[PDB]
Structure formats: C-alpha cells, structure tokens
Amino acid sequence: HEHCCSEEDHRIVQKQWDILWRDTESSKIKIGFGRLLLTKLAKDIPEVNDLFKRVDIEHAEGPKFSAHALRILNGLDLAINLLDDPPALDAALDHLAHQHEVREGVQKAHFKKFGEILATGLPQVLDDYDALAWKSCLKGILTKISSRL
Amino acid sequence: HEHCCSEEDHRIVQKQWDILWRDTESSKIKIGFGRLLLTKLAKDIPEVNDLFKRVDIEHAEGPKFSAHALRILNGLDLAINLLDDPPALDAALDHLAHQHEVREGVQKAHFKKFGEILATGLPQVLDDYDALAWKSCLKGILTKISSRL
Amino acid sequence: ECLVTESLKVKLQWASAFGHAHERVAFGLELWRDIIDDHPEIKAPFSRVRGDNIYSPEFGAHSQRVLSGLDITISMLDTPDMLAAQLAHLKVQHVERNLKPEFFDIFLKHLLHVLGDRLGTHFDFGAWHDCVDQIIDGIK
Amino acid sequence: ECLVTESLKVKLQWASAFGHAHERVAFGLELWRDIIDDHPEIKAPFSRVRGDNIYSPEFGAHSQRVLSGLDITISMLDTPDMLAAQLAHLKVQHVERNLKPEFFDIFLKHLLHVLGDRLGTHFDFGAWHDCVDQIIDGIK
Amino acid sequence: EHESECRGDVPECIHDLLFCDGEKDCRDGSDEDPETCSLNITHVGSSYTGLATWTSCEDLNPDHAIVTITAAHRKSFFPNRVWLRATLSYELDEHDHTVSTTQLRGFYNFGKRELLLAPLKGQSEGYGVICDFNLGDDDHADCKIVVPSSLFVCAHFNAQRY
Amino acid sequence: RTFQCGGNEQECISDLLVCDGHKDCHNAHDEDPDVCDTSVVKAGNVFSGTSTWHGCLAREDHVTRITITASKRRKFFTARIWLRALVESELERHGENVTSSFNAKGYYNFASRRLILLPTDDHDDHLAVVCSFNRGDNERAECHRVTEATLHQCADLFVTLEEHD
Amino acid sequence: DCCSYEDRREIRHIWDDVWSSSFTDRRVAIVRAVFDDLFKHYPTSKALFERVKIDEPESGEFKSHLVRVANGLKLLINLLDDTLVLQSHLGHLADQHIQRKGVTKEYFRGIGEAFARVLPQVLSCFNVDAWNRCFHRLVARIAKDLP
Amino acid sequence: DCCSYEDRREIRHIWDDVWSSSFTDRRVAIVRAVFDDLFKHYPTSKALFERVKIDEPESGEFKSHLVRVANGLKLLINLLDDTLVLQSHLGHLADQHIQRKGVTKEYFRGIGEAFARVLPQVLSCFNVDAWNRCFHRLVARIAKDLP
Amino acid sequence: KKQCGVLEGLKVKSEWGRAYGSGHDREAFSQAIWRATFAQVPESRSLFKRVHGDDTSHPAFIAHADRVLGGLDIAISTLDQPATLKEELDHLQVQHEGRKIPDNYFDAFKTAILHVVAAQLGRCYDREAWDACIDHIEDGIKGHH
Amino acid sequence: KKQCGVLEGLKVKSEWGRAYGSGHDREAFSQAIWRATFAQVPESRSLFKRVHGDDTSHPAFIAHADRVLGGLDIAISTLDQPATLKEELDHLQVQHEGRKIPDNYFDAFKTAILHVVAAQLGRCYDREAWDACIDHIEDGIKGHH
Amino acid sequence: CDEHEHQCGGDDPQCISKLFVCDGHNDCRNGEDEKDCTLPTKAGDKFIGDVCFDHCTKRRPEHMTLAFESSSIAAFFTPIADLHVHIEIESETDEDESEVSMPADGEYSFADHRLTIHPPEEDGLGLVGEFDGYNFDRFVGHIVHELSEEVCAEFIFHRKK
Ligand code: HEM
Ligand code: HEM
Ligand code: HEM
Ligand code: HEM
Ligand code: HEM
Ligand code: HEM
Ligand code: HEM
Ligand code: HEM
Ligand SMILES: [Ca+2]
Ligand SMILES: [Ca+2]
Ligand SMILES: [Ca+2]
Ligand SMILES: [Ca+2]
Ligand SMILES: [Zn+2]
C-alpha cells in the first residue's frame, strides 16, 4: 500500500510528462489534449455534459471551454509536479477535492472512467510511456481528488 | 570591415588546410595542386604564360616549374600559417607584394581570377570546406599581396 | 485519419528525428539514397537537380528544399485551412511533370523506414502512416 | 551439422547479441522490419498480431514471444531429447497456417544478417548457419 | 576489484583478503602496519551520521541517517575481517520525529577501508549500507544506503563520526 | 543553478535562496556569513589581469581592468547583488597604446560566486565579461569574455584584486 | 500490492541470478522444484499435464515443457521495462491458459506460493516481498478470467 | 560586411529562439509582423502578393504563404554550416524571385530592415549587427540580378 | 513604457517558459517570488491565513504558491489567444473579487515576479515587456487599470 | 541444521562460482584459506612438509593450494550429478587414505573455507548450506560421517 | 596550455613554447621559464628504483639502480641537458645468477622535468622518468617501448643519498 507511486515511479512519470512541454506552444497542446480528454469522457458518460455545461462544453473550441481545458489539464500538471513532496501534493490535492465536492453531479465512477481514458490517451502523445508507473501515480491522484462526493 | 577572416574564420581555414598535409608526400601534392592552379590560370588568361615563362611554365612537369609550383603554393602556406598573428602575417605578405611589384606584367585582375580558381579548386581536394570562411581569408591575403602593381 | 493527438505526436517526433543544421542534410541524403537505390527510375525527373550524384550540392540543396516543405505540411496538420491550401500549392509544383502516383507511395515507405531508425521503437508508426499519408494524397 | 563446440559458440554469441530487456525489443523490431521489407507477403499471416504496424505493442509482443522461443531452441542445442521435442512442438504451432517453407529460409537469412551487425566480425557464421538451420528444418 | 593498494611509498596492489592477516604481504609491509589495521572504525559503539538525501526508494526528503556499530568480534584465526553488527536509523517525519531503526550484520574490509552492512534477515526487509572511509581519516566516510539484494543505491549521505 | 550545503549535511538549494535571509539548508550554510560576503564585489574594487584571446577577436594578449562602479542590494530580495562596473582594456592597435573601455551593468550571485557584467547597451558591440571567484578567496577570479546570447567563450581572463597601498 | 519501479529493478536483478547459464540444466531443476511444490500442495493440478507426460519426469517431452514455462516467465520479467508490450503479452498469456480446460484461479495463486518457497533456496539475497508484489500483479492479470 | 563563422553561430542560435515550436502560430505572427513593416514602408510591394490573397489576411491561402517564406528563411539559416549547398539553394532562391515580375532589389533591402526592427522585439538577446551582417550576405546573393 | 501587444507577448510567453521551469526549480521559483512579495508588504500575509501564510515553507502554502503560478501560467501561455486568455483572466477575476485586495499588493507581487524572473533568466530578459504583460494580466484580474 | 540436497547444492555451486573467482583472486582466495586452516591447527603443517608447508607463500605450496581448491571445485561443481561427483570424491578419497588425517583437520579446513568464502561474498551467502555441502564433500573423502 | 607549451603559473597565467624554458631569454612575464633551471640528475648521482609493476623487463627485477656517469649542457641550447647513464641490475635465478650494467644516452628537459633515457638494449625498451617539479629525490620511472611510448613497467626511483 506504500509501494504505490514510489520515488522511481514518479521520477519516471515526471520525466515522461515533460516530453510534452518541450515546445513553447504548450497552450495549443494542453488545450487540445485536455479538450479531447474531457470530450471522450462525455462520450462514454453523458450525464457529464450537464456538469461541464457551465463552461460551455457544448463548444469544444469555444474559449469558455478552452480556458477550462487548461485549468484542469494544468491542475493535473500541478499534481504531477508536486509528486516529489507528499505533504504539499497532499494539500494540493485535498484542495482539489473541495473544488469538486461543491459541484453536485460529479460522482466517483466519473474519475474511474477519466482515469481509464487518461491512461489510454497519454501513450498516444508520449513515445516513452511506462504504464505501470503512471497507473500507480494517476490512481493515487485521482482517488485523493474525488475522496469527497 | 574588421569581421573579415576572424579568429574562428581562420581557425577553420587553418584546420581544413591541414587535412592536406597528413601524408609525408606533401611535395607530390603541393606540386600537382599548385601546378594545376597556375595552369588553370594561364588557361583563362594567357598573358600569364609570358610571366611564368622565366620558370619554364611551358613544361608543367619540368623541374623548373615544379620548383616554382612549390614556392608559390608554399607561400600560400606561409600566409595561412601566419593568420594567427596579424602583424607577422602583414609583414610576411607585404614582402610578397614587393616580390610581385618588380615583376611587370602582373596586374590585379590576375589575382582576382586566381582567387576564383583557388576557391573552386580547394573544395575538390578537401572534403570539409567552409566557403565562407575561406573566401573571407583568401581575399585578405590575395589583396595585400597585389597591393603594389 | 489524423486527429488531434495523432498529429502532435508526429509534430513532436518530427522534431527529434529531423533535427537541426547539418543533422538534416544527413537525414535528407540518407533518405533519398535509400529511395533511389530501390527505384532508380526516379533519377529521371531529378535531372535538373543532379539526381545522378545525390552527394552534390545541387541535389543537396534540392534535398533540403523538399524536407523543408515536408516540415511545413507537418507543422500544419493541426490547422486544416492552411494544410488544405499548402497541399494544393505543392500538388501544382509537381503535377507539371511525369510523376507516377506510386512514387509518393514509395517516398512514404522510406520516410517511415528512416524515421524508424532515427526514432527507434518509440516511433509511432500508426500516427505517422495515418498522418503523412494525408499529406501525400494531397500532392499525389 | 551442429556438434558440441559449434553450439556453445552460438549459445554464447546469442547471449551478447540478443541482450536483455529493451535491448531485445530493439533487436526483434530491427529483425522483423528487414524481413517484412524484403518480403511483404509475410504481413499476411501476421494479421492477428498487427503485422502492418510492427512498432505497435500488439506486434511488439509477438516479436518478443518469437525471439523467446528462438532462445529456448538455442538453449537446447546441447540436449537433443529436449530440442527434438521442443522443435516438434513449435512445428505444430506453425503448420496450422499457410506457411511457405521458404519463409523460414528467409527468416534465417536475416537473423544472420542482424547478428552479423550486432556481433561484428567475430560472428561465427559457420556455427550459426549449421546450427540455427537445424532449428528451422524442425519447424519448416 | 577485490584489491587495494599498499599504504607504503610504492603503490603495490594486494588482494583484499590479505590485509591485516599477520603476514607481511605488501612489498614493505604496509598491509600490516597499525595505521592500516586500526580498529578505530570498528570500535563498539562507533557511530557515523550525515544527511541522507534519497534518490530511489522512499518519498522522504533529506533526513538524518545514523549507522552505528553495536557489537564486533574478530575471529582469532581469520583477522582479515572484523565481523560486526550495527544499526541504521533515519528520521521519518521531521515533525513528530518518528524514526526507522533496522538492525544490521556485516564486516569491515581493511583493504577497501569499507564498512559493509546488511539487514539481519527477517525484520521488515529494510535497507543495507555501504560506507567508504577513503576520506583520509577514521572519522569521515562516504556512506550510501543500499538495497541489500543488489547493493543498489537507495540514497546517499556523506557522514562524520560521533 | 543549485547550491551545495555543508560537507556533512549535503543537500541542494535553488540559488533563488542562495543567500536570501531565510535558513534553507539543514546546516544553514546557505546564510553562513562567509558565503555572502558583500565585499567580493564591493563598489570600488578593481580587478586586473591578462586577457588571452582565442575566440572572437584578433587581439594581442592585452590586459583588462574590471572595476566595480556601483552596487545595489534590494532589501526585499537579497539573493543578488546588482551592480554597475567599468571595463577597460589597455591594448595596442595601429601605432601606440589605446584604451577600449565601456560601461557595464550586471549582478553577483553568491551561490556560484559568479559576477556577470553586460554592456550598458553600448552599441559598439563589446563582449560581456563573466567572472567566477572559485579560488578559495575573494581576491582572485576566473573570467571569460562571451557573447551574451550563447555565452560562448571568446577569451580567458584571470583577474586579481588590486592592492590599495 | 503495487509493482514499483524499484521492485522491478530488484527482480530484473534477482532473475539474472537464476537465469544465468544459457544451458537448460539449471533453469530446469528450479522450475521443476517449483512445480513439485505446486503438486505437493495442489495435487489436483498434476493431472493437467498428462499432455506433456509428467508421468515421465525425465521424459524430455516434459523437460522441454518446464523450459517453456521457465522461458515464458523469463519473457515476462524481461518485459517489465516495456510496460505496454508486457500488458499485451500478459493478456495473450492468459488466453493460452483460459483455453486450457481445468486451470483454476487457485492453481496460480498456488504456483505463486511455490516460487516464494523455492527461489529463496536457490539463491541468496532474495527480496521475497518485492518478488511477491510484482509476481502477484503478473498473476492477477493472467488468471483474471481463469477460475 | 562579412558573415563570420562566429556570426553564423550567433544566428544558428538566435533562430532557435524564434523557430522554437513546431506549430505555425508563432512563426506566422512573426513573419507577418515582418511583412506588415515592409508594406508600411514600401506599400508598392503589397500588390505583388495578390496571387496569395493578401487582401484576406487570415485567408490561409496567405497564411500558408507566410509560412513558406518563414520556412524558406529557416532553410537558409539551417544551411549556414553547409556553405556549398547554401551557395546553390541561395541562387535557386534568386531565380524564384527573378521570374516574379515586379520584385525590386529595393524591396529586399526593405524586408531586411523589417526583420532588424521586428526580431529585436520578439526575443531578447538579439545581436542585431551579427544578424544584419549575415542577412545582407544572404540577401545580396538573392537579389543580385533582381533590380 | 510599452504595451503588451503581439510581439512583446511572444517574448514574455517564451521567457516565462524558461523562468517557470519545472520540478524543484518551480517549487522554489514560486517560493522565492512569494518571499519577495511578503517581504515588500508584510501586511498581505493576513490574506493567506487560510493557507498557512505565516510559514511560507508549509506544504499548504507550497501548494498554494505552486497553484498560483499555475494560473499565471495559463494567463501568460495565452497572451496570443485574446479569446481564451480573456476567459481565464475573467475566471481568476472572480476567485479574487470579494477579497479586499488593494492595487497596492498586486504591484508588489508584480515586482516580486519580475525580480525573481530576472534572477532566474540571467541575461536574456526584457524588463519593459514583462512589466507590460504582467500588468495586462493583473488588470484582467482586478478589473481596474 | 540442513542437508546438502538438490537446491542447497545449486546454491553453494553458484555462490562458490563467485567466491572462487580466477587469476589472482584465486591465488589469494586459496592463500587466505590455508592461512586460516594452519592458524587453527598448526599441527597439520607437518603433513605438507613435502610441498613447503613451512612457507605458505612458497611457489610449491602456492601450486599445492591452487591445486587443492581445484579438486574442491570439481566436487562442488558436480553436486548436481551424484554419478560423477561420487567418482571424483572417490578419486580424492584415495589420494588421501594412508595419510593419518584426523577428522580434526578436515573440520578446521572447512571452517577456514567458510570464513574466507563469507569474507569474499560479502552479503549473499547461506552459511548452513555451505556447511552442509562442504561436509558432504568431505565425508566423501574421509569415508566417515 | 597547448600540447607543446609551458605554463608559467602564478595569479596570471601565460603559455610559452617548451623550447623556451631555460633558454636564456626571459620569455614569460613572471619569469618561471627561467628561474627554476637546476639539473636534478647530475654526474655522480645515483637513483635506486623499487619495482611495483613490471610487464616487460627481461629480468622482472626487484630493484634497479640508475647511475649517472656524465652530463653536459650545450652552451647555446640551455633547454636540454644531455646525459650518459648506466642502468645497473642484480638478477638471480635457479640456473644462474646474472648482473648487468647497460649504458645508455639520454637528455633531461627543464621544459617538463622529464629525463628520457634512450633504449639501452636493442629490444626497444627505454626509461622515462618525469620529475615532481618540486621534489627531485624521487621520480616515477616508466619503462616504455620507445616507438610506441607504451608503459609496461613502473619503478619509484629514490635518490641514493
Ligand atoms: C485528475 C483530473 C482532474 C483534475 C486535476 C481536475 C481539475 C479541475 C480544476 C482545476 C477545476 C477548476 C476549479 C476552479 O478553478 O474553479 C475543476 C473543476 C471541475 N471538475 Fe475537475 N478535475 C479533474 C477531473 C474531473 C473529473 C473526472 C470530473 C468529471 C465529472 C471533473 C469535473 C469537474 C467539474 C464539473 C468542474 C467544474 C468546472 C466549472 O464549471 O468551473 N473533474 N477540475
Ligand atoms: C596567393 C597566391 C600567390 C602567392 C602566395 C604567390 C607567391 C609567389 C612566390 C613565393 C614567388 C617567388 C618569389 C621568389 O622566391 O623569388 C612568386 C613569384 C611570382 N608570382 Fe606569385 N604568388 C601568388 C599569386 C600570383 C599571381 C595571381 C600571379 C599571376 C600573374 C603571380 C605571378 C608571379 C610571378 C610572375 C612570379 C615570378 C616567378 C619567377 O619567375 O621567379 N603570383 N609568387
Ligand atoms: C511528400 C514529399 C514531397 C514533398 C513534400 C515534396 C516537396 C517538394 C518541393 C517543395 C519541391 C521544390 C520546388 C521548388 O522550390 O522549385 C519539390 C520539387 C520536386 N519534387 Fe517533390 N516533394 C515530395 C515528393 C516527391 C516525389 C515522390 C518525387 C519523386 C519523383 C518528387 C519529385 C519532385 C521533382 C522532380 C521536383 C522538382 C525538381 C527541380 O526543382 O528541378 N517529389 N518537391
Ligand atoms: C525460427 C524462427 C521461428 C520461431 C522460433 C518461431 C516461433 C514462434 C512462436 C513461439 C510463436 C508464438 C505462438 C504463440 O504463443 O501463440 C510464433 C507464432 C507464429 N509464427 Fe513463428 N516462429 C519462427 C518463424 C516464423 C516464420 C518464418 C514465420 C513467418 C511467416 C512465422 C509465422 C508465425 C505466425 C503467423 C505465428 C502466429 C501469430 C499469432 O499468434 O497470431 N514464424 N512463432
Ligand atoms: C507462473 C505463471 C505461469 C507461466 C508463466 C506459465 C507459462 C506457460 C506456457 C508458456 C505454456 C506453454 C504454451 C505453449 O507453448 O503452447 C503454458 C501452458 C500451460 N500451463 Fe502454464 N504457466 C504458468 C502457470 C500455470 C499454472 C499455475 C497452471 C496450472 C496448474 C498452468 C497450467 C498450464 C498447462 C496445463 C499448460 C498446457 C501445457 C501443454 O499441455 O502443452 N500454468 N504455461
Ligand atoms: C528574406 C528573403 C526572402 C525569402 C527567404 C523569401 C522566400 C520566398 C519563398 C520560399 C517563396 C515561395 C516560392 C514557392 O513556393 O513557389 C517566395 C515567393 C515570393 N516572394 Fe519571396 N522571399 C524573400 C523576400 C521577398 C521580397 C523582399 C519580396 C518582395 C516584396 C518577395 C516577393 C515574393 C513574391 C511576390 C513571391 C511569390 C508568391 C506567390 O505568389 O506564390 N520575396 N519568397
Ligand atoms: C497575477 C497575479 C495573481 C494571480 C494570477 C493569482 C492567482 C491565484 C489563484 C489561481 C488562486 C487560487 C484559487 C483557487 O484555486 O482557489 C489565488 C488565490 C488567492 N489569491 Fe491570487 N492571484 C494573483 C494575485 C494575488 C494578490 C496580489 C493577492 C494578494 C496579496 C492574492 C490573494 C489571493 C488569495 C488570498 C487567494 C486565496 C487563498 C486561499 O485559497 O485560501 N492574489 N490567486
Ligand atoms: C575437502 C577438502 C580437501 C580436498 C578437496 C583435498 C584435495 C586435495 C588434492 C586435490 C590434493 C592433491 C593431490 C595430487 O594432485 O597429488 C590434496 C593433497 C593433499 N591433501 Fe588434501 N584435500 C582436502 C583436505 C585435506 C586435509 C584436511 C588435509 C590435512 C590437513 C589434507 C592433506 C593433504 C595432503 C598432505 C596432501 C598431499 C600433499 C602433497 O602433494 O605432498 N587434505 N588434497
Ligand atoms: Ca598481510
Ligand atoms: Ca525525493
Ligand atoms: Ca536561504
Ligand atoms: Ca625563456
Ligand atoms: Zn573591451
């Protein structure tokens, strides 16, 4: 239970997640990627479309949503970049829990799915992907984030 | 006007010009090369044949000329090898100017041509050639040599 | 079909593979050599750019110009309006010559073979095939 | 004919060449690529394991499974009773498909070509040819 | 590997298994002079500490590591090695001060001047530790917390004695 | 870009804390007075030495004279000493002794004991100078003339603080 | 119950000690010794291998089998650095056992115990826990649909 | 007015800062911003690009153009280490502009000024002189017969 | 002295990429910035009482910091997409309105950022440019000028 | 405490591989072992009077030592082939019967081996296992238990 | 400094050609190239070498004495002092017991405090000892193949005082 997402584990994740932000046009990427990630979520579970209604998910390319795409995708960044400081990461995530707690409609099963999606997506943009390491870490993150619903 | 044939520039020229003298039979090379260089000059401008008459240019393979081939080609060496000591190089070249001044018949247009020839020849014997660097340096040299005519 | 990720992947890998300065000429050369040895029929249209001697500067130049265009197209996979236009523009510069549409199918075969070496096992064949293909058909 | 030394030689060289972990996938990949480019007819039976995209994980898996078996056979060259059995076992897993016996003659051609690169001039071609051959016929 | 140089003026190399065994093995006998066979390091109660900064086996942010010797005997007929037992302790939570304490077994190599300890086998399978005292004296060492199994470096800490 | 702490409690610190006023290292070596002696680059200090050229100029081995003009230290950000300085180069050109000098602005970083001096936009194209005081003291430093862009090294320059007597 | 990267490294080494020689002999005796422990505990399973002639221990038809098992394990471990491929072959390895009528989810948990009892005897410095952890992750996926 | 090797190195770097992303967006805005400065100073030239539809800035038929120009420049710079090839493509680049009726020797000297005014704004640490030097050598050869 | 236009944006957006960095550099970059901010206006510590503003090194705050720069990232990272940026800024604007944050603080926080960034980038860094853009971004969060 | 069975054999056989080593390590490994043996029972030096047992560093003895380990190698290296081992042991048995070698010495020599091997292998080494096998090998040379 | 240049040290370094060290002209600003020109191995002196790594000598001897017979410096080329040396050796086997005193020429370069002793026997083996710079009572002596410059024997030589 304590061997999940270990130093080496995340040291890896971190390294691999960086292959992404090598070029200055991170925005275009983060957006496109996050956009797709959320879309593919609403695809498999529609009751989501209503949750992201507030951010005009109806218009994927709409700034309203594009901004959102960043915020989330960028939050995942924060999570990953704090992997090497458990107490901080903890706090950082707990905070994310609360930001999701007051958003009724969002249930655990959503994250479980988003996780599966994220796990099938990453390896499509990263040539070097270590499924084992990632799954280990993503789990810890996604869980702590939804631990309030 | 002071960025022509800079330290890096000639450091390069020098390095590339050395690819040539790796084998002990420098004579055979210097000669053949210098021989060709002068020949190809008389080819494009015949009034030259009369200048090199004194050294039996008529007999390209004739020792009389072969020796000459060296002297000249070897002078170019001196020039190149003193590129990293402007005052010396200067003096060394000025001297070459005088050795050409008292040789009537030799006009500037000759050097301009010899330069173009030299620039088309070098890259034929050197696999690694940096046209820009060389042209920069060869210019400075050829000019200072003919600055008396 | 080249969607959003399948592009970024290529856009990214192209970076590492292609490279910068000389590293490129090397790439181009290696590429065309493998292509011409497989189908010497191509040395024909490349007559204007000394295709007989691929190591020559004349051809070297060409080689580069080519890869460059490829760079452009690849850098436009995300924006359709520009790609569709760019591709159409390239088709014209080609159609004007006896070009067996299979030549491109060949070019592609090798471009992948080469990137394969350069990138190694990480090379996302899928993404490239689906993506570079679309670029060829727009010129074929 | 693969005697006692001619085996140990291969058993040993296989070690250095094949390698460990990733080093292997790389080998497998390089191998199959060269094979498929030479005879694209093979992409056919490899349809189950995405043979169109050799860089895919599906095929990658396969690639490895193969080499592994090859490892086994090679590690049995010294013990005949096990080899004869193992080989027979492999023949079955293959016969069930339209497999031109020449395919193996091809596979061998490349396996040697590749080991050639990996091992260099030390590569004991003789030993391998005499020895790996004996493994193929038992499956051909 | 498996050899260390004499401390004499002549940098001769002799096998580790030969230092301090009672028989002049080095050209000059440097492998037997006291300045070499000093037990100063393996003295009972000896303790070395530094700041462990982990690079491979635990969340933990730089914390204090302490490898201290708990008992050590030298079999009369086999002097080459000073078999011993020690304890490796490193802070867990810098705030509530919890701290891990694994018991170790091992020896000290006169040749390499290296302390090699591993867990006693059967106690939560913790870590081991390698300390080189090649730092010049008997009080400074370059310790590295390893994983017994592969001696793979879990973390590193430059230690001092006291 | 990181600061190594005391040889006993070894640990890395970002030079944005190099010497900021808050104990960041376990041994606090990142606030140890001797690490942050402002005197290294006290205004008025003068460093001279020979500049041997091997990269971007056909200059004869001449001397350079870096002299600190001024030095501010933001009270809300101590990790850096901002400073202005005067770089002179007594070199021989066409004829006799000339002097090619220029005004510079830059900073001093305790963590690396690096002193970076860039030209005050002097559009005459001067090579930024860079010194490291890695020599065990605050008197001597190892410098190089470089292009502000690539930081490519055009020349080697070993300076020494001039005595005031 | 997570196979850490460190643990993988641990195993990627532990293995290099059992799978040293390129000669069957060793690996055989070990894999065998493993099964003997499986059969002494879940005798039932024994019958499953009549196809390979377990009644003839030194048969060769069976020895070869043992090797294939060994090598199949080797292949797994030697894939721990290429996750994605491992994840696939790991599935393929399941299917090869699902079509083998009579193979329970239990027998696997049983062979797992086997190694954990054998390995610690064939080599020293065996991180039983680390092994156990990553072995379970491997087994779980193999016999997910096996029971 | 000589493009030194050092200068080449300077540029081979300066460029790596503008031509960072493999996404059009950036390079576009820059090359555009460059032309906008060419047109604000030599408005005559504007007409020359009706073929690519400059009247439709966001057209795409035009954006693609900008890119081609950008990339054409990129290709040049990324050739500064292979002199001989550069010297040839540099010619080929001329011919592509000589056959473009209406392109003066002036317009080039004008776009040169353009960059020298734009670049220093899109990135810091721009050796305007070094750029200027090697850019002129490039331009000169391109429009030697253009006037 | 300059407005956060097209180019000046690209410049800051790029330079920010280098200064921001990742991993520990980040956890510090933010650290440094906040220390510089609070050092300027100790009064402001009272606003982050909820997220341990008393101890800049407390995980809670570390998170907060790293979380703040996060937004700033999105902001800067989109200075070339007015449409989107607009949104992010507006979003932030909300998370802040309500808190009595004087233009006094924002000013200090900008200064902080600038000084740290300058310390991090060494030589290649345009001050005016950043000033202009950090400003434009802050304006979008206050609503003022 | 354990018998030299199948596995315990493989273990010793493997560990021995590492401890034995080659070249100089060997010339010493043996050296160390003998010194440890003679130190225990100086009485035994008298038996190797023929091969300069007086000076453990004399070539004659060096040979002898390196020669002895040799047999021990064959022994251990075949603990997994009872058939063959049996033979080697028997062969040794002969070269030894006749010499008044008390079970007392063999005991010391085992101890020696064990202590040195442990010193050489550092951490990965099962004592019981070696004890058990070195024993089984010695028994095969004495004839006793 | 470059391959064939001498470093003058000090708080302000300067590289000059090794052909200038101890030549009579003040080539270095500081003067190093001329203030330390004392010849260590001068006529009469004897040096005893203790072996510690011998993979080539014909005798693989325990020691090796190095006697300096004569030494003269050319008045016009101070940078190199020519030496005449006898390399003595005390061998002793089972089949015999030999003694040797092979004579060889050699020079000492103040340029880098390195005395090169030309091969004594026609087996292509010569000695090359480089001095500390400040010691002069102990130098590491490498026995090499002149042609190749391969090291195959190291002896620590001490001045027999
Ligand atoms: C690990 C991935 C996730 C991260 C890191 C994450 C991050 C975020 C962040 C930063 C916000 C914006 C809070 C703010 O600034 O006001 C947010 C809001 C939200 N998240 Fe997540 N989220 C993740 C997964 C999910 C999942 C699985 C769901 C799906 C039901 C979800 C549903 C929402 C909703 C509905 C909002 C409200 C957005 C709005 O209207 O403002 N999130 N999330
Ligand atoms: C950079 C290339 C050149 C170099 C370095 C060079 C060098 C020399 C040298 C060393 C001499 C011999 C002086 C002596 O020892 O008495 C010489 C003589 C001469 N050079 Fe050049 N030269 C060069 C180019 C030219 C050109 C372009 C011309 C063509 C008109 C030219 C015409 C002559 C003539 C006519 C002589 C007289 C040779 C004789 O009869 O002795 N040189 N040059
Ligand atoms: C997908 C890859 C390809 C791209 C992106 C591409 C791009 C280019 C470009 C930009 C030019 C230079 C036009 C100019 O500036 O004058 C060019 C010229 C040409 N291409 Fe392609 N090309 C590709 C594939 C092919 C293939 C398959 C053939 C091979 C038969 C081919 C034959 C030609 C020829 C003959 C020329 C003109 C040579 C000349 O300038 O004399 N191209 N190509
Ligand atoms: C001497 C080298 C060869 C060896 C040792 C070998 C070994 C293997 C092994 C062990 C498998 C995996 C069976 C399984 O676990 O399901 C396999 C499958 C197969 N082999 Fe081979 N093979 C060799 C050569 C070939 C050749 C020449 C061909 C090429 C036509 C071939 C075609 C196949 C096919 C089509 C499969 C089944 C793919 C699937 O699982 O869907 N093999 N081979
Ligand atoms: C440690 C995990 C295991 C691995 C890695 C493994 C590996 C293998 C392999 C490679 C094959 C041979 C496939 C072929 O070449 O056709 C196989 C077959 C089989 N396995 Fe496993 N196996 C494992 C555990 C088990 C367990 C626990 C049982 C249950 C008793 C089992 C029962 C079988 C049977 C009966 C076959 C069929 C053999 C035949 O008749 O040819 N396996 N296994
Ligand atoms: C900095 C140097 C310049 C570069 C590197 C450059 C590059 C290019 C390139 C690559 C093309 C496209 C060729 C094709 O794909 O068919 C082109 C076309 C052209 N260039 Fe330039 N150019 C430069 C300067 C100029 C200048 C100063 C003018 C004059 C205003 C100019 C006018 C044109 C025009 C009008 C075309 C035709 C575009 C069309 O209608 O397709 N160029 N240039
Ligand atoms: C351009 C600069 C600024 C940006 C981009 C910014 C961004 C942020 C962000 C993203 C949050 C976290 C919101 C959440 O996830 O709940 C935040 C929170 C906050 N900001 Fe700002 N902020 C800026 C300037 C300021 C200033 C000047 C102050 C006052 C000194 C300030 C005071 C706060 C406070 C008190 C919080 C909430 C703390 C909490 O969560 O308890 N911010 N800011
Ligand atoms: C398992 C342990 C032992 C092994 C494997 C062993 C092996 C050997 C071997 C191979 C030889 C050399 C035979 C030859 O080539 O002529 C030898 C010789 C001998 N062994 Fe042992 N031996 C062992 C224990 C002992 C012990 C305990 C003693 C008594 C202290 C002993 C006394 C002798 C003597 C005196 C010789 C003959 C010396 C000679 O050649 O003059 N051995 N032993
Ligand atoms: Ca000793
Ligand atoms: Ca850590
Ligand atoms: Ca600090
Ligand atoms: Ca001198
Ligand atoms: Zn200056």
From TrEMBL, chains C, D:
Gene3D superfamilies, A to Z: Globins (1.10.490.10)
Q: Which keywords belong to this entry?
A: Disulfide bond, Heme, Iron, Metal-binding, Oxygen transport, Signal, Transport
Which residues take part in binding heme b 1? R48, R65, H94
Q: Which GO terms describe its molecular function?
A: heme binding; iron ion binding; oxygen binding; oxygen carrier activity
Q: Which cysteines are joined by disulfide bonds?
A: C2-C131
Where, in this chain's numbering, is heme b 4 bound? R65, H94, R97
| Globin domain residues | 1-140
| Annotated binding of heme b, by residue | H94
Origin superkingdom: Eukaryota
Q: Name one GO cellular component term.
A: extracellular region
Asked whether the UniProt record includes Disulfide bond among its keywords, one would answer yes
Residues annotated as binding heme b 2: R48, H94
Q: Does the keyword NAD apply?
A: no
Q: Where does heme b 5 bind?
A: H89, Q93
Name one matching Pfam family.
Globin
Residues reported in the UniProt entry to bind heme b 3:
R48, H94, F104
Family to which the UniProt record says this protein belongs: Belongs to the globin family.
The name this protein carries in UniProt is: Extracellular globin
Origin organism is Lumbricus terrestris
From TrEMBL, chain E:
Q: What are the protein's GO molecular function terms?
A: metal ion binding
What intrachain disulfides are recorded?
C6-C26, C20-C37, C57-C154, C131-C143
Please, which domain of life does this record's source organism belong to?
Eukaryota
Give UniProt keywords alphabetically.
Calcium, Coiled coil, Disulfide bond, Metal-binding, Signal
Domain named Annelid erythrocruorin linker subunit C-terminal is located at 42-161
Task: Write out the residues that bind Ca(2+).
Answer: L18, D21, E23, D25, D31, E32
Key word Coiled coil present in the record? yes
What protein name is recorded for this chain? Answer: Hemoglobin linker chain L1
Counting on the full-length protein, the chain here runs from: 79 to 240 of 240
UniProtKB/TrEMBL annotation, chain F:
UniProt protein name: Extracellular hemoglobin linker L2 subunit
The terms under GO molecular function for this entry are: metal ion binding
UniProt keyword list: Calcium, Disulfide bond, Metal-binding, Signal
| UniProt domain Annelid erythrocruorin linker subunit C-terminal: residue ranges | 41-160
Q: Where does Ca(2+) bind?
A: L17, D20, H22, D24, D30, E31
What taxonomic classification does the UniProt entry list for its organism? Eukaryota, Metazoa, Spiralia, Lophotrochozoa, Annelida
Disulfide partners: C5-C25, C19-C36, C56-C154, C131-C143
Q: Which residues of the full protein are shown?
A: 102 to 266 of 288
UniProtKB/TrEMBL annotation, chain K:
Q: Name one GO molecular function term.
A: metal ion binding
Q: Which cysteines are joined by disulfide bonds?
A: C1-C15, C8-C28, C22-C37, C56-C152
The residue ranges of the Annelid erythrocruorin linker subunit C-terminal domain are 40-160
Keyword Transferase recorded: no
Swiss-Prot/TrEMBL keywords: Calcium, Disulfide bond, Metal-binding, Signal
Q: Which residues are listed for Ca(2+) binding in this entry? A: F20, D23, H25, D27, D33, E34
Disulfide bond keyword on record: yes
Name under which the protein is recorded: Extracellular hemoglobin linker L3 subunit
Question: What is the species of this protein?
Answer: Lumbricus terrestris
Included stretch of the parent chain? 80 to 240 of 240
